[PDB]
């Protein structure tokens with residue numbers, strides 16, 4: 001089963017993503033194929049998949065930027081029926097907004113079927129151009145047709161996943177305790193994590209004994225990433241990944257406060273020094289506490 | 293011995309505080325007697341007392357706002373010698389800026405003696421008017437003269453003191469762990485804590501599932517109080533008191549993230565709800581973790 005999470009949804013035949021045109025919140029805004037840049041935030045192309053209770057393999061798909069839902073227009077089973085963004089709710093009973101998502105016959109990509117119409121999300125004619133129509137279309141679960149096949153590229157971690165990446169790190173103190181604050185997290189590219197740091201004003205902050213020292217830098221970075229999240233995205237039900245750690249050096253006589261993020265493959269953490277913007281696989285400290 | 297800390301220094305004969313005139317950082321800015329308002333930040337009237345290593349009962353006194361030091365002008369032992377703010381450093385060997393501070397013969401107020409001149413800080417003629425001259429003057433350790441007697445009203449807590457106030461609270465979970473970030477903390481009046489909340493923009497923030505929920509409010513408040521500290525005060529070597537707590541309800545099935553401060557008498561904590569500005573002796577949660 002596809003897991004709850006945020007996905008960048010990429011056609012299997014051509015490198016077009018599912019894009020809500022201009023990120024618009026208007027009802028009936030077209031969902032189209034569009035090119036994308038890897039290792040960036042693709043602002044109009046992220047989708048929060050919310051599993052429906054007791055309805056196997058069935059989800060709402062909420063655009064992260066607009067807060068509006070993937071909607072098959074009037075639920076029509078006619079081939080060519082528009083797929084658009086439309087107002088809704090995460091656990092709606094409106095079948096126009098409910099999608100059964102299961103692996104295709106290649107075992108890697110998925111097909112996306114409207115729960116009411118039983119038709120599939122289709123990149124019409126396999127057209128790779130920016131703005132190409134996506135429609136509901138007749139199809140089967142098992143056929144090869146790449147027009148109806150979609151890679152769900154996972155852009156978030158659950159809290160259990162973040163905890164696993166931390167636990168595999170070698171720079172964790174024996175007395176470590178971690179404090180989990182949310183359930184599902186958008187993982188940022190370093191380019192974006194850095195941009196938030198820059199825009200927070202921290203690059204200009206001066207270290208001052210106790211009154212603006214390492215703990216203040218680290219907490220300010222976390223707060224800046226939390227503000228960024230709320231100010232940037234209209235969907236609810238996820239957070240943005242940015243941790244704080246306290247750590248102690250090998251000699252046991254100096255402690256430090258810093259941030260952390262996740263690798264691109266989501267399997268490991270990487271430390272961030274908010275006093276200078278650097279990313280480090282070894283910051284010189286073993287973490288005794290984290291919150292994220 | 294007077295403990296390291298921040299003090300509001302009040303004459304024993306008349307209710308005038310030691311005030312660095314207009315908070316000015318200029319060398320030679322007069323230190324004068326001035327009236328004050330209890331339970332406020334008295335912006336020009338706070339002094340960070342730094343003990344000198346191996347020099348019994350002897351300190352520098354740094355104005356918290358200006359960052360400049362109490363200085364006996366050219367170290368003169370003449371009665372009437374100006375006491376002024378002047379550039380220096382926390383552990384200076386300049387005797388013009390070193391002060392031996394010990395209890396007077398009333399056992400409550402202190403006398404303040406210049407380490408070089410052996411003269412005492414004196415509110416000239418006991419004058420209660422705003423802007424009255426403070427000077428160095430001849431005197432004795434044991435005499436009653438109220439012109440040379442000063443109540444050191446303690447406005448900060450050590451970390452050990454904050455930890456004690458938390459440990460006496462009844463709403464602490466069995467699994468509680470606290471994480472100490474600094475060593476000495478300015479305790480804010482609630483009026484000021486509230487003003488920082490208002491000025492942070494939090495009163496206008498909307499609760500949103502995971503993306504701006506209780507943890508985000510609490511961390512933003514802490515960050516706002518940390519920014520306030522650095523932007524408001526020029527002295528170093530202290531922090532501003534504002535904690536974050538995570539807690540769990542009695543039934544064990546709901547958790548919450550909130551802030552905390554200290555009572556006026558510094559002996560107890562009081563919870564703060566950053567979603568609405570309220571102060572509570574019981575927020576409905578027992579804390580399992582804190583950082584401050």
Ligand SMILES: C[C@@H]1O[C@@H](O[C@@H]2[C@@H](O[C@H]3O[C@H](CO)[C@H](O)[C@H](O)[C@H]3O)[C@@H](O)[C@@H](CO)O[C@@H]2O)[C@@H](O)[C@H](O)[C@@H]1O
Nearest residue numbers: 027071072073074075086087088089092094095096097
């Ligand atoms: C059959 C029809 O279903 C619902 O209307 C849908 C639309 O539903 C969504 O938007 C409407 C406002 O237009 C409303 O906010 C609703 O809660 C939301 O789910 C939408 O799916 C469009 C495009 O496919 O189709 C129908 O208009 C319902 O509101 C109608 O009363 C009626 O039951």
Ligand SMILES: C[C@@H]1O[C@@H](O[C@@H]2[C@@H](O[C@H]3O[C@H](CO)[C@H](O)[C@H](O)[C@H]3O)[C@@H](O)[C@@H](CO)O[C@@H]2O)[C@@H](O)[C@H](O)[C@@H]1O
Nearest residue numbers: 079122123124125126127137138139140143145147148
């Ligand atoms: C080039 C082409 O690929 C396949 O046709 C697709 C369409 O395939 C879907 O619709 C057809 C009926 O129109 C049939 O139901 C098929 O099972 C289903 O997957 C559809 O993807 C459209 C729009 O993008 O493009 C092509 O027509 C294939 O069936 C055709 O034989 C042909 O090889």
Ligand SMILES: C[C@@H]1O[C@@H](O[C@@H]2[C@@H](O[C@H]3O[C@H](CO)[C@H](O)[C@H](O)[C@H]3O)[C@@H](O)[C@@H](CO)O[C@@H]2O)[C@@H](O)[C@H](O)[C@@H]1O
Nearest residue numbers: 319363364365366367378379380381384386387388389
């Ligand atoms: C005896 C004299 O002592 C020092 O000068 C002091 C002043 O010292 C303070 O300010 C000066 C700059 O004016 C400098 O920054 C110094 O480090 C600092 O401690 C001050 O106490 C004034 C007013 O009482 O008196 C003397 O000017 C030293 O700089 C001089 O060279 C000389 O040794």
Ligand SMILES: C[C@@H]1O[C@@H](O[C@@H]2[C@@H](O[C@H]3O[C@H](CO)[C@H](O)[C@H](O)[C@H]3O)[C@@H](O)[C@@H](CO)O[C@@H]2O)[C@@H](O)[C@H](O)[C@@H]1O
Nearest residue numbers: 371414415416417418419429430431432435437439440
């Ligand atoms: C009213 C007055 O109070 C006391 O005199 C103080 C001064 O006291 C200090 O200085 C005198 C010498 O001028 C002497 O050394 C005394 O021990 C020392 O405390 C001084 O505080 C000035 C400036 O504020 O005001 C008064 O003159 C007292 O000795 C006088 O007899 C008289 O009762």
Ligand SMILES: C[C@@H]1O[C@@H](O[C@@H]2[C@@H](O[C@H]3O[C@H](CO)[C@H](O)[C@H](O)[C@H]3O)[C@@H](O)[C@@H](CO)O[C@H]2O)[C@@H](O)[C@H](O)[C@@H]1O
Nearest residue numbers: 019020021022023034035036037040041042043044045
């Ligand atoms: C917010 C906006 O994002 C970018 O433009 C989007 C655009 O983004 C995708 O396509 C561009 C090329 O047009 C790049 O491949 C990006 O990496 C993609 O994410 C599309 O989403 C369209 C259609 O909805 O809207 C544009 O606003 C960027 O080019 C803009 O500068 C801007 O940052």
Ligand SMILES: C[C@@H]1O[C@@H](O[C@@H]2[C@@H](O[C@H]3O[C@H](CO)[C@H](O)[C@H](O)[C@H]3O)[C@@H](O)[C@@H](CO)O[C@H]2O)[C@@H](O)[C@H](O)[C@@H]1O
Nearest residue numbers: 311312313314315326327328329332333334335336337
């Ligand atoms: C920053 C400034 O603070 C206040 O004025 C100070 C003044 O403050 C004291 O005296 C006033 C009465 O003049 C009240 O009692 C305050 O509670 C005191 O803290 C003095 O410090 C003088 C001399 O250094 O400077 C003034 O700037 C306040 O009145 C101003 O509005 C302002 O907030």
Ligand SMILES: [Ca+2]
Nearest residue numbers: 181182505507
């Ligand atoms: Ca949360």
Ligand SMILES: [Ca+2]
Nearest residue numbers: 210213474531
């Ligand atoms: Ca600090």
Ligand SMILES: [Ca+2]
Nearest residue numbers: 213215473474
């Ligand atoms: Ca610290």
Ligand SMILES: [Ca+2]
Nearest residue numbers: 182239502505
């Ligand atoms: Ca959150």
Ligand SMILES: [Cl-]
Nearest residue numbers: 126127128129
């Ligand atoms: Cl094409």
Ligand SMILES: [Cl-]
Nearest residue numbers: 142143144145
């Ligand atoms: Cl096939």
Ligand SMILES: [Cl-]
Nearest residue numbers: 050090236237
């Ligand atoms: Cl949701």
Ligand SMILES: [Cl-]
Nearest residue numbers: 418419420421
């Ligand atoms: Cl008077």
Ligand SMILES: [Cl-]
Nearest residue numbers: 434435436437
């Ligand atoms: Cl006497």
Ligand SMILES: [Cl-]
Nearest residue numbers: 342382528529
């Ligand atoms: Cl200091």
